[PDB]
Swiss-Prot record:
Superkingdom of source: Eukaryota
Compartments (UniProt record): Nucleus
Disulfide bond entries: none
Family: Belongs to the MDM2/MDM4 family.
Reported tissue expression: Expressed in all tissues tested with high levels in thymus.
Protein name: Protein Mdm4
Comment block on domains: Region I is sufficient for binding TP53 and inhibiting its G1 arrest and apoptosis functions. It also binds TP73. Region II contains most of a central acidic region and a putative C4-type zinc finger. The RING finger domain which coordinates two molecules of zinc mediates the heterooligomerization with MDM2.
Post-translational modification: Phosphorylated. Ubiquitinated and degraded by MDM2. Deubiquitination by USP2 on the other hand stabilizes the MDM4 protein.
Species of provenance: Homo sapiens
Segment of the intact protein contained: 23 to 108 of 490
Length: 96
C-alpha cells in the first residue's frame, strides 16, 4: 500500500521546539522536548493564562511585549482573532 508507505513515520508529526519556545512550554507545565503541534498550542494558551498576558476586558488581546513570548513573536501585542504572528513564530520555532 503506497499510502501506508508514504504516511509511515509521519502519522503523529511531533515537533521539537527551539530552546526559547521550549522554556515557554515548560513554564506552562510541559515536560520533555517532543510534542504534537496540538500540545504546543495547549501549552502556549496555558502560558498566557498563567502569566496573565491577556486583557481581562478584551480577553482575545495578548500583551506579550517585554515577555519572552513577545520577543519570539517580535510583537508587543496580538489578537487571537488575527493570529498571523503566531503562525509565523511556530513555522520558525518548531523543528520536524
Ligand atoms: C476571546 O477570548 C479568547 C478566545 C480564544 C482564545 C484562544 N484561542 C486559541 C487559539 C488561538 C489562535 C490559534 Cl492560531 C490557535 C489557538 C487559544 C490560544 C492558543 C495559543 C495562543 Cl498563543 C493563544 C491562544 N486560546 C486559549 O488559550 N483560550 C481558549 C479560550 N479560553 C481559554 O481559557 C484559553 C483565547 O486565548 C487566550 C489565551 C488569549 C482567548
Amino acid at each position: 500500500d503506497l499510502e501506508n508507505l508514504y504516511f509511515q513515520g509521519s502519522q503523529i508529526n511531533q515537533v521539537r521546539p527551539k530552546l526559547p519556545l521550549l522554556k515557554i512550554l515548560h513554564a506552562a507545565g510541559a515536560q520533555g522536548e517532543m510534542f504534537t503541534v496540538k500540545e504546543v498550542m495547549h501549552y502556549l494558551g496555558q502560558y498566557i493564562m498563567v502569566k496573565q498576558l491577556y486583557d481581562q476586558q478584551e480577553q482575545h488581546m495578548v500583551y506579550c511585549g517585554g515577555d519572552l513570548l513577545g520577543e519570539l513573536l517580535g510583537r508587543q501585542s496580538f489578537s487571537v482573532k488575527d493570529p498571523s504572528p503566531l503562525y509565523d513564530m511556530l513555522r520558525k520555532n518548531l523543528v520536524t
